[PDB]
Scaffold this motif. Structure first.
Motif, PDB file in Angstrom:
ATOM      1  N   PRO A 231       0.886  -1.337  -0.072  1.00  0.00           N
ATOM      2  CA  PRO A 231       0.025   0.203  -0.070  1.00  0.00           C
ATOM      3  C   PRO A 231       0.791   1.382  -0.079  1.00  0.00           C
ATOM      4  O   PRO A 231       1.668   1.293   0.736  1.00  0.00           O
ATOM      5  CB  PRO A 231      -0.823  -0.014   1.194  1.00  0.00           C
ATOM      6  CG  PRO A 231      -0.684  -1.552   1.687  1.00  0.00           C
ATOM      7  CD  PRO A 231       0.644  -1.985   1.313  1.00  0.00           C
ATOM      8  N   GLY A 232       0.707   2.299  -1.013  1.00  0.00           N
ATOM      9  CA  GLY A 232       1.254   3.556  -1.096  1.00  0.00           C
ATOM     10  C   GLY A 232       0.491   4.687  -0.379  1.00  0.00           C
ATOM     11  O   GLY A 232       0.973   5.761  -0.670  1.00  0.00           O
ATOM     12  N   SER A 233      -0.629   4.341   0.116  1.00  0.00           N
ATOM     13  CA  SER A 233      -1.457   5.456   0.756  1.00  0.00           C
ATOM     14  C   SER A 233      -2.072   4.541   1.749  1.00  0.00           C
ATOM     15  O   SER A 233      -2.407   3.569   1.711  1.00  0.00           O
ATOM     16  CB  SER A 233      -2.328   6.148  -0.281  1.00  0.00           C
ATOM     17  OG  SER A 233      -3.332   5.268  -0.584  1.00  0.00           O
TER      18      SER A 233
ATOM     19  N   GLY B 276       4.887  -0.191   4.169  1.00  0.00           N
ATOM     20  CA  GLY B 276       3.736   0.239   3.542  1.00  0.00           C
ATOM     21  C   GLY B 276       3.176   1.487   4.331  1.00  0.00           C
ATOM     22  O   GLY B 276       3.827   1.692   5.454  1.00  0.00           O
ATOM     23  N   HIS B 277       2.058   1.806   3.701  1.00  0.00           N
ATOM     24  CA  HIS B 277       1.470   2.899   4.561  1.00  0.00           C
ATOM     25  C   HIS B 277       0.293   2.478   5.336  1.00  0.00           C
ATOM     26  O   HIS B 277      -0.566   1.658   4.650  1.00  0.00           O
ATOM     27  CB  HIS B 277       0.536   3.892   3.599  1.00  0.00           C
ATOM     28  CG  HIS B 277       1.789   4.537   2.791  1.00  0.00           C
ATOM     29  ND1 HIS B 277       2.172   6.097   2.687  1.00  0.00           N
ATOM     30  CD2 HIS B 277       3.045   4.101   1.883  1.00  0.00           C
ATOM     31  CE1 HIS B 277       3.265   6.002   1.919  1.00  0.00           C
ATOM     32  NE2 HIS B 277       3.543   5.252   1.540  1.00  0.00           N
ATOM     33  N   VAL B 278       0.264   2.270   6.430  1.00  0.00           N
ATOM     34  CA  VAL B 278      -0.944   1.592   7.198  1.00  0.00           C
ATOM     35  C   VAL B 278      -1.121   2.591   8.560  1.00  0.00           C
ATOM     36  O   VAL B 278      -0.311   3.042   9.213  1.00  0.00           O
ATOM     37  CB  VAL B 278      -0.500   0.418   7.673  1.00  0.00           C
ATOM     38  CG1 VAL B 278      -1.653  -0.331   8.563  1.00  0.00           C
ATOM     39  CG2 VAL B 278       0.106  -0.418   6.899  1.00  0.00           C
TER      40      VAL B 278
ATOM     41  N   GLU C 196      12.063  10.898   1.741  1.00  0.00           N
ATOM     42  CA  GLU C 196      10.999   9.957   1.019  1.00  0.00           C
ATOM     43  C   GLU C 196      10.209  10.500   0.449  1.00  0.00           C
ATOM     44  O   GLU C 196       9.295  11.229   1.222  1.00  0.00           O
ATOM     45  CB  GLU C 196      10.625   9.027   2.243  1.00  0.00           C
ATOM     46  CG  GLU C 196      10.179   7.657   1.901  1.00  0.00           C
ATOM     47  CD  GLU C 196      11.354   6.558   1.905  1.00  0.00           C
ATOM     48  OE1 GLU C 196      12.459   6.854   2.281  1.00  0.00           O
ATOM     49  OE2 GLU C 196      11.019   5.593   1.112  1.00  0.00           O
ATOM     50  N   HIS C 197       9.801  10.354  -0.705  1.00  0.00           N
ATOM     51  CA  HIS C 197       8.967  10.624  -1.813  1.00  0.00           C
ATOM     52  C   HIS C 197       9.221  11.877  -2.344  1.00  0.00           C
ATOM     53  O   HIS C 197       8.591  12.548  -3.025  1.00  0.00           O
ATOM     54  CB  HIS C 197       7.604  10.916  -0.949  1.00  0.00           C
ATOM     55  CG  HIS C 197       6.926   9.863  -0.496  1.00  0.00           C
ATOM     56  ND1 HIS C 197       6.185   9.653   0.756  1.00  0.00           N
ATOM     57  CD2 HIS C 197       6.821   8.579  -0.920  1.00  0.00           C
ATOM     58  CE1 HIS C 197       5.629   8.681   0.871  1.00  0.00           C
ATOM     59  NE2 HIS C 197       6.195   7.670   0.050  1.00  0.00           N
ATOM     60  N   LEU C 198      10.663  12.426  -2.077  1.00  0.00           N
ATOM     61  CA  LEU C 198      10.878  13.561  -2.589  1.00  0.00           C
ATOM     62  C   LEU C 198      12.278  13.851  -3.148  1.00  0.00           C
ATOM     63  O   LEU C 198      12.127  14.573  -4.495  1.00  0.00           O
ATOM     64  CB  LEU C 198      10.895  14.781  -1.215  1.00  0.00           C
ATOM     65  CG  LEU C 198       9.407  15.047  -0.533  1.00  0.00           C
ATOM     66  CD1 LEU C 198       9.628  15.936   0.606  1.00  0.00           C
ATOM     67  CD2 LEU C 198       8.748  15.718  -1.689  1.00  0.00           C
TER      68      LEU C 198
HETATM   69 ZN    ZN Z   1       5.130   5.523  -0.222  1.00  0.00          ZN
END
Ligand code: ZN
Ligand code: HMH
Ligand code: ZN
Lengths: 515, 512
Positions: A347-349, A385-387, A449-451
């Motif tokens: 999961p990425g959200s 993941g994103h949780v 991260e993500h940037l």
């Molecule tokens: Zn992510």
């Protein structure tokens, strides 16, 4: 500023093996003021020889192959007739080994034959932090049904590896390695990533491991990635991991469509002879699962998962990593490479956490684990993941059930998506909790991260953040070594022994400056 | 420090019960292609982020609240009330009329809904449409969170002491906010050690998300400086009166007594402090219980009271005079923050007899405070390993009759000086999940030094996001919206919207 030498406030110490009297297992020791009447505090140290004054470092020679002799002494391996073939590393002085036909070689194989190996005593010592077995440590915490010993013996390490509830990543061709253990019943480990000159590359590894990184992933894409990994593995004392899919992808000029079993098999063998200690393989990304990711908010966010989906949808064949799984195990077990069964469907959200897709891959990873064990190969499983916090325990309970208690290796969890530039914090919340719940390893997350790409300070912030996240978890699990360090630091605070406070910390230099 | 917050604009919603209320919000609009409405974010920054409003710190903010208080006619001007001096001539000073009701609690109990209450209900809704209910996903451990907040629901929560609106009548500058388990988790920033620079520290903390602010200043001029802070604050201000009473007697704790204390309360009450931290729970019998600790007593207020108790061998005079303290406070609507002088300063000391004996005592005191019609919240840990955090919550709900919980952290480990914002964010997220109403923030320089402006930002951002993770996990109605909006942007490569939907867009955009 500096990458080498003692870590400020501490000195490198060794403990010797008994089963294997030639083993010297590393630690670092922090002495406190004499007035305190306290013994020196013993801390787990993965930095290796780079923080040992006694050993001189020559990256063109690589670290001392302290482990080569122990593997050869078992006589289960032979030199390889003719092995596969940015500056080139001078690899003349190293023999390249492969198991002998029909022989046992993997830590899992031995443990199940009732044998205890050098690596297993190494680790039991390492995990005890030089505590005295005779003194009854009194337990305070909550391990949710774990089996943590008051003191760790090599035999207990054999048991854990036997039931697949722990692993010791140790490619026979990685003689520079200082073995470590991954597993719920041990100290929570952390991994740091590397990759995009040579000295600059090795230095990023020295740096991550200086601050606490237990293992390191070469996530390099592009050209020269094999030649550069030479300098990294020859100079690492921590286990090195990769995603062999990335290297196979460059052998076919970046076109997912053009992957196939051959270039993949060749990449496996190269890396196996080179010394990679574990492979991330997204063998769980199956054809029928891809459609399940359409109703997601962020879709597929694994780089390895994406590559496999691209291949499955173009050929309408099943994931060839899942199809050729058996032949993959036959190669890995000839070198003792370990599995990191990847989660291409992570999961990425937070919206996408614990959905059908992630859980379908999880069950498939579970089946795959069982198959891997039959071939006698060591296995761990990748997770979120994103949780959001409230779904974090569920993710743990699913994994212990369908994955037969194999070691869990999560990235985070990110507990919220709203703080780009701070994801090391959002993920440290999730990571601390999941390590408490039973996770064996945490892949770190840097502020960028993500940037963007992490500079050396970001990497350090990431490492320290995860070291403390892992420790917070050890405390909560009631791990016998955890509270010592905590109490030691807190006594120094109470007696105004400022100097010992700084040196007892994860980052003395920073603590001392801020004061 | 001023102007719109990058990527957003200030927006207002108007009251119905109270047609003249203008409740603040900020709004973030996304690319037209996305076919999404603008995302509404909770904003405590106040008028400093509104361009249409001119800031003059020597005049202070517009007293938008004075009229609503006076309209209730429960107060009267005070005949004669008690570093540059703040020109306070244009401001009348108020006290309750004899025998009249003034506190939010008192009103709520009398079945009355007040301006503050509707202000809050609106604020907590984030301009959501009551029409389209949101579907619930989370775990609130027996909380009572509404799909939509109404003023009546706010009166109920205040009535049972399960929520509080800190709002001294002499603080007309305030944009009222709600503290309570059943609302959005709020965070608190600290201030204190020139005038422009002090007010700046509060504008900065509030710019980034701080819902309230405590003046923890010690030394001289602490009262005169606080004038500048309160008169320019749109967020509730709190203090520890003991700090100020301690300077009236030149720093000697033995020399404290009921008189200088009484005088300090009244000064601050007229000045406008919205709530007091009072270590009334540090009793004589407890002090000996902190001897077998690893770090001992680590509250500054706790230490002071202990020093006083052991030198006079009398009981804590704050606990003795507790009734006469409630009688002062209720005459202005100051709220209690019953302090925990016995908080653990090391993981080893968590959940021990001393901290729990004080917790049960604060529970007793809570009950007494209510009879006097005074609003109450309770302070908590401290240093606590994760495994002990739920226990601490369960203890407080039981023995404190569900009063709003106000923790600092908890720090989940002691081994990381220079990063205590991280160790405390882990505990803070969890405890907020479990039911904590407010989290006092922690900056990187905790245990080490004094926070510069950057540290204060990291501290605030860290707690805003901790409080949010907690709202997400509690299944709060408004939380998922913002998460899903920021994730859709990520998925469509709408990078600019991803930055603007973040807690710190400038940093996000720089890093990229
Ligand atoms: Zn992510
Ligand atoms: C962004 C990203 N995706 C996937 C992986 C593992 O496949 C990784 N390390 N990073
Ligand atoms: Zn502390």
């Amino acid at each position: 500023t500096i990458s080498t030498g003692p870590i400020p406030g501490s000195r490198k110490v060794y403990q010797a093996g008994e089963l294997f009297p030639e083993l010297r297992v590393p630690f670092r020791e922090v002495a406190v003021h004499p007035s305190a009447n306290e013994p020196p505090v013993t801390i787990y140290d993965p930095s290796g020889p780079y923080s040992d004054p006694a050993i001189q470092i020559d990256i063109e020679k690589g670290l001392p192959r302290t482990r080569e002799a122990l593997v050869v002494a078992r006589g289960d391996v032979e030199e390889v007739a003719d092995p596969r073939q940015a500056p080139e590393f001078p690899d003349t002085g190293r023999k390249i080994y492969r198991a002998k036909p029909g022989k046992l070689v993997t830590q899992l194989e031995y443990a199940r034959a009732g044998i205890i190996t050098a690596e297993m005593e190494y680790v039991a010592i390492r995990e005890n932090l030089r505590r005295e077995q005779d003194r009854p440590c009194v337990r305070d915490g909550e391990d949710f049904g774990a089996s943590i010993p008051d003191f760790v013996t090599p035999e207990f390490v054999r048991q854990e590896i036997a039931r697949g509830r722990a692993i010791i990543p140790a490619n026979i061709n990685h003689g520079e390695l200082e073995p470590m253990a991954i597993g719920r019943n041990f100290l929570v480990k952390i991994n740091a990533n590397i990759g995009n000159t040579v000295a600059d590359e090795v230095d990023k590894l020295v740096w991550a491991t200086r601050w606490g990184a237990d293992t390191v992933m070469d996530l390099s894409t592009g050209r020269n990635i094999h030649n550069i990994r030479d300098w990294i593995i020859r100079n690492s004392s921590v286990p090195i991991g990769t995603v062999p899919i990335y290297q196979a992808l460059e052998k076919v000029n970046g076109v997912a469509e053009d992957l196939n079993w051959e270039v993949f098999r060749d990449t496996l063998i190269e890396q196996c002879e080179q010394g990679v200690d574990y492979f991330t393989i997204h063998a769980g990304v199956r054809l029928p699962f891809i459609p399940m990711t359409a109703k997601r908010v962020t879709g597929i966010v694994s780089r390895g998962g994406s590559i496999m989906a691209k291949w499955c949808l173009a050929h309408h064949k099943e994931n060839f990593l899942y199809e050729r799984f058996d032949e993959i195990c036959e190669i890995m077990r000839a070198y003792d490479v370990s599995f990191s069964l990847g989660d291409g469907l992570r999961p990425g959200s937070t919206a996408d956490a614990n959905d059908e897709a992630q859980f379908s891959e999880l069950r498939t990873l579970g089946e795959l684990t069982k198959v891997a064990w039959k071939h006698g190969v060591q296995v761990m499983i990748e997770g979120p993941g994103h949780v959001a916090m409230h779904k974090i325990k569920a993710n743990m309970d699913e994994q212990l059930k369908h994955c037969h208690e194999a070691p869990f290796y999560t990235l985070g969890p990110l507990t919220t998506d709203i703080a780009p530039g701070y994801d090391h914090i959002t993920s440290a919340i999730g990571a601390a909790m999941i390590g408490w719940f039973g996770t064996a390893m945490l892949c770190y997350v840097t502020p960028k991260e993500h940037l963007g790409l992490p500079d050396r300070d970001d990497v350090k912030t990431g490492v320290i953040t995860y070291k403390l996240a892992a420790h917070a978890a050890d405390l909560a699990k009631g791990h016998p070594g955890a509270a010592m360090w905590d109490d030691a630091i807190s006594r120094a605070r109470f007696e105004f022994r400022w100097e010992d406070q700084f040196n007892l910390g994860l980052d003395p230099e920073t603590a001392r400056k801020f004061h």
